Structure 1
C-alpha cells in the first residue's frame, strides 16, 4: 500500500504481549531493530504492562529520557525499541538486571538476573561467510556482525558475547546431547536435550528433543537455540525450566497453593 506501515492495530498485535482489548485501539508498533517484529517485546510493553512501573506511554518516555534503562549495555530513548530473546535490560536505579526469556506458555518472563550474568548474552549464529578483504564474520540472531570468529563455528551454533566489547568469549557446537531453548511454534519456551537431527535436503531440518520428564517432541531447526550441555545451562533459566505440565498437572499444583 504505497509504502511501509507505521501503525499496528491492537488485535493485530502479537498475542504473547497480553495487551487488553478495550483500553486502546492501536498497540505499540516495534521500531525496526535487532529482532523481528512478531518476535520482539517493545520497551513500553516491558515497563508498563509487565513490570508495572509506568502507567501510561507518557511515563515510559519520562523513564527513557532520564537515560536509566539500557538494552545490552547501551541506553535507548525509543518507546518501541524491539528488545527480544536473550537481551539484557539493565535499570541503573533499583539495580535490577533482567534477561528476556520465554516461559513455557510462550511469553516473555520477568526473569531477574545477577549483575555478573548481565555481562554476557548468547547468540545463535545465523550465517557465517567471508566479508570484504577476505575477513570472515558471523551473524547472530540479534543481527550482530562479529568479525574474526573461531573457524570451528558453523551455522546453528550458539556464541557467548561480551556486550561491553561485543566479542566471542566462548561458543557451543550444535550436536546431539546439547540442551536447547525452543524459540517458536507450539513448543515455544520448552527446554530439552537434542536426540537427533533429520536432514531433508531442499526443505526443513527437524530436531527431536527429549526433556527431563522424558517427553519427546519435534520442532523445526529454525526454532531451536543451543544453551549449553546436558544439565549445564550457560544462562540462568526461569522458574519451571521449560518443562510443560498438563492442564491437569498444572491444576494440581494450584491446589498446593490453595491451602493458604
Structure 2
C-alpha cells in the first residue's frame, strides 16, 4: 500500500476517450484537483497541443500558459494540467476563438465555437443541498462551486444558469418529464433526447427513460442526466443533433471520406 497519494499516471492506464497514442511514451499528464474529477475532465495541454496544435511540446504550452494567453470561465489559468470539464467556457482573445466544451456522440470531448451573446453564462447541475455554519443554506454543482442563500423553489438535480462575471443565478430549469436532456455518463454519452418516464427503486438508483428526436429510446441512471433547456436547447450545440449512427452508416461515411 502506497504511503501517500499518487502523483503519476501511466499512459496505458489513462482514460480511453483522451485518445493517447500507445507509443507516445510511458507517462501521461496527471490532472490536478479542481473543478472536475480525473475521469470527468481533460487536461488543458491535451487540448492545446494534441488538437488545436498551437504547441508542439510541453515547453511551448508552459510558455503560452505562463504568459496568460488562455481564459477559463473568465479567469486566466497557468497550469498545464488544469482540468477542463463539461459546459465550460474556453476563450483565446488573441485569435478571437470562443469555445464551449461539450460531448460528441462517440463519447469524446469537443469544442463548439460560439458567439459573444451567450459566452457570459454557463449551465451547471445542482446535486447537493445542505445546511452550513449557523444553519445558512448552501448548494453545490458539478464544477465545485458553492452559492449561499438560494431560492427555496430550487431543488436537487435541477439545472442553474449563472453569469461568468458574477456567480448569481439568473434562471433555473426544473427536472421534469417532457424536458430535453443530454446524457453525460456511460454507454450513451453525448446523446440528446427528451424524458418520457421516471422509475425509482428504494435505496438504490433511479432510472430515466428518454426518446431521441428520431424515435430511438434508451435508458441510464439519474447521476448522468443533464438538462439543457425547456423543449429546446438554451445553448448552441455541435452540427449533429445528438444522433448516434449505426456501424453501417459510420462505415459508409468513412468510405465517402476516403
The secondary structure found in structure 2 opposite 1:104 is coil
Q: How far 1:118 moved relative to its partner? A: 1.4
Residue 156, structure 1, aligned to residue 119, structure 2: no
Count of matched residue pairs: 257
Could you list the per-position Cα deviations for residues 63-86 of structure 1 after superposition, in whole angstroms to 9, with x for gaps in the alignment?
Answer: 101111011110101000011001
Residue 246, structure 1, aligned to residue 252, structure 2: no
Q: Give distance in 2, aligned partners of 1:94 and 1:155.
A: 39
The secondary structure found in structure 1 opposite 2:12 is helix
Q: How far 1:169 moved relative to its partner? A: 0.9
Could you list the per-position Cα deviations for residues 125-166 of structure 1 after superposition, in whole angstroms to 9, with x for gaps in the alignment?
Answer: 010122222322210110100112121111110101101001
Q: Give distance in 1, aligned partners of 2:241 and 2:80.
A: 30
Q: How does 1:85-100 map to 2 (within 5 A)?
A: 85-100=86-101
Q: How far 1:224 moved relative to its partner? A: 0.5
Native 8 Å contact 1:193 1:210 kept in 2: yes
TM-score, structure 2 normalization: 0.96
Native 8 Å contact 1:51 1:110 kept in 2: no
Could you list the per-position Cα deviations for residues 14-35 of structure 1 after superposition, in whole angstroms to 9, with x for gaps in the alignment?
Answer: 1111111112211111001110
Q: How does 1:73-84 map to 2 (within 5 A)?
A: 73-84=74-85
Native 8 Å contact 1:50 1:110 kept in 2: no
Q: Give distance in 2, aligned partners of 1:151 and 1:129.
A: 12
Gaps of 5+ in 2: none
**Structure-2 residue corresponding to 1:142:** 143
**Structure-1 residue corresponding to 2:180:** 179
Structure with the higher strand share, 1 or 2? 2
Q: How far 1:250 moved relative to its partner? A: 2.4
Q: Give distance in 1, aligned partners of 2:154 and 2:129.
A: 8
The secondary structure found in structure 1 opposite 2:48 is helix
